[PDB]
Write an enzyme that holds these catalytic residues in place. Sequence first.
Site, PDB file in Angstrom:
ATOM      1  CE1 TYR A   1      32.371  -8.397  34.901  1.00 57.03           C
ATOM      2  CE2 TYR A   1      33.175  -7.241  36.846  1.00 57.03           C
ATOM      3  CZ  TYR A   1      33.226  -8.322  35.986  1.00 57.03           C
ATOM      4  OH  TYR A   1      34.134  -9.332  36.195  1.00 57.03           O
TER       5      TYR A   1
ATOM      6  CG  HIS B   1      33.191  -6.905  30.520  1.00 59.49           C
ATOM      7  ND1 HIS B   1      33.487  -8.077  29.853  1.00 59.49           N
ATOM      8  CD2 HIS B   1      33.507  -7.107  31.823  1.00 59.49           C
ATOM      9  CE1 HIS B   1      33.968  -8.947  30.715  1.00 59.49           C
ATOM     10  NE2 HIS B   1      33.993  -8.392  31.914  1.00 59.49           N
TER      11      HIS B   1
ATOM     12  CD  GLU C   1      32.003 -11.397  32.300  1.00 55.22           C
ATOM     13  OE1 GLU C   1      31.998 -11.655  33.521  1.00 55.22           O
ATOM     14  OE2 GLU C   1      32.909 -11.774  31.538  1.00 55.22           O
TER      15      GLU C   1
ATOM     16  NE  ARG D   1      31.667 -11.704  36.638  1.00 53.71           N
ATOM     17  CZ  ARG D   1      32.131 -11.848  37.873  1.00 53.71           C
ATOM     18  NH1 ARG D   1      31.318 -12.214  38.857  1.00 53.71           N
ATOM     19  NH2 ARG D   1      33.419 -11.650  38.124  1.00 53.71           N
TER      20      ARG D   1
ATOM     21  CG  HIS E   1      35.119 -16.866  37.580  1.00 53.60           C
ATOM     22  ND1 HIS E   1      35.765 -17.138  36.392  1.00 53.60           N
ATOM     23  CD2 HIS E   1      34.837 -15.543  37.562  1.00 53.60           C
ATOM     24  CE1 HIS E   1      35.877 -16.026  35.691  1.00 53.60           C
ATOM     25  NE2 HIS E   1      35.322 -15.044  36.380  1.00 53.60           N
TER      26      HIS E   1
ATOM     27  CG  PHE F   1      32.813 -17.832  33.296  1.00 56.69           C
ATOM     28  CD1 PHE F   1      32.253 -17.317  34.460  1.00 56.69           C
ATOM     29  CD2 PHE F   1      33.551 -16.982  32.472  1.00 56.69           C
ATOM     30  CE1 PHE F   1      32.418 -15.968  34.804  1.00 56.69           C
ATOM     31  CE2 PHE F   1      33.722 -15.644  32.799  1.00 56.69           C
ATOM     32  CZ  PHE F   1      33.151 -15.134  33.970  1.00 56.69           C
TER      33      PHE F   1
HETATM   34  N1  LIG Z   1      36.633 -16.518  30.501  1.00 59.39           N
HETATM   35  C1  LIG Z   1      36.137 -15.620  29.675  1.00 59.39           C
HETATM   36  N2  LIG Z   1      36.566 -14.363  29.712  1.00 59.39           N
HETATM   37  C2  LIG Z   1      35.923 -13.536  28.864  1.00 59.39           C
HETATM   38  C3  LIG Z   1      34.923 -13.863  27.997  1.00 59.39           C
HETATM   39  N3  LIG Z   1      34.498 -12.731  27.293  1.00 59.39           N
HETATM   40  C4  LIG Z   1      35.252 -11.766  27.746  1.00 59.39           C
HETATM   41  N4  LIG Z   1      36.140 -12.193  28.692  1.00 59.39           N
HETATM   42  C5  LIG Z   1      37.198 -11.413  29.267  1.00 59.39           C
HETATM   43  O1  LIG Z   1      38.379 -12.023  28.710  1.00 59.39           O
HETATM   44  C6  LIG Z   1      39.447 -11.946  29.663  1.00 59.39           C
HETATM   45  C7  LIG Z   1      40.022 -13.373  29.948  1.00 59.39           C
HETATM   46  O2  LIG Z   1      39.141 -14.327  30.561  1.00 59.39           O
HETATM   47  C8  LIG Z   1      38.844 -11.247  30.892  1.00 59.39           C
HETATM   48  O3  LIG Z   1      39.097  -9.818  30.751  1.00 59.39           O
HETATM   49  C9  LIG Z   1      37.367 -11.579  30.749  1.00 59.39           C
HETATM   50  O4  LIG Z   1      36.524 -10.652  31.445  1.00 59.39           O
HETATM   51  P1  LIG Z   1      36.099 -11.017  33.001  1.00 59.39           P
HETATM   52  O5  LIG Z   1      37.395 -11.442  33.614  1.00 59.39           O
HETATM   53  O6  LIG Z   1      35.491  -9.758  33.500  1.00 59.39           O
HETATM   54  O7  LIG Z   1      35.106 -12.105  32.889  1.00 59.39           O
HETATM   55  C10 LIG Z   1      34.475 -15.208  27.939  1.00 59.39           C
HETATM   56  O8  LIG Z   1      33.640 -15.649  27.154  1.00 59.39           O
HETATM   57  N5  LIG Z   1      35.142 -16.038  28.832  1.00 59.39           N
END
Ligand SMILES: Nc1nc2c(ncn2[C@@H]2O[C@H](CO)[C@@H](O)[C@H]2OP(=O)(O)O)c(=O)[nH]1
Length: 104
Positions: free
Chosen positions: A38, A40, A58, A77, A92, A100
């Site tokens: 993060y 990312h 996020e 987040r 989450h 989310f």
């Molecule tokens: N759910 C979700 N995941 C995202 C999004 N953008 C990037 N990700 C990343 O996509 C993958 C599947 O959800 C994870 O690696 C997630 O990172 P994080 O788990 O850190 O949020 C988004 O808009 N929604």
Amino acid sequence: ACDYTCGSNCYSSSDVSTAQAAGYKLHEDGETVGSNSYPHKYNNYEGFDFSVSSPYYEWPILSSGDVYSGGSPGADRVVFNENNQLAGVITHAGASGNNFVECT
Ligand SMILES: Nc1nc2c(ncn2[C@@H]2O[C@H](CO)[C@@H](O)[C@H]2OP(=O)(O)O)c(=O)[nH]1
């Protein structure tokens, strides 16, 4: 007081503002922390109607009030963009899988 409610966590505008500043600073320097690196990019798979333009990033906001520094990110987040504008606060908590829902 309770400007943003993420599940059972209550956040003030100050809490969000402090977390956002920390995450934006790291993004600006090109540095990341934690196992998920993060801040990312947040691709918006959920399709939230953000009022600010992408790209989005996020960054974890902690219920304890501490600024995230690489440990357990928790469920909440803050999402900000390239202009350091707040896009939204998401969580989450109450969502399925790695999805989310918005904090209200
Ligand atoms: N759910 C979700 N995941 C995202 C999004 N953008 C990037 N990700 C990343 O996509 C993958 C599947 O959800 C994870 O690696 C997630 O990172 P994080 O788990 O850190 O949020 C988004 O808009 N929604």
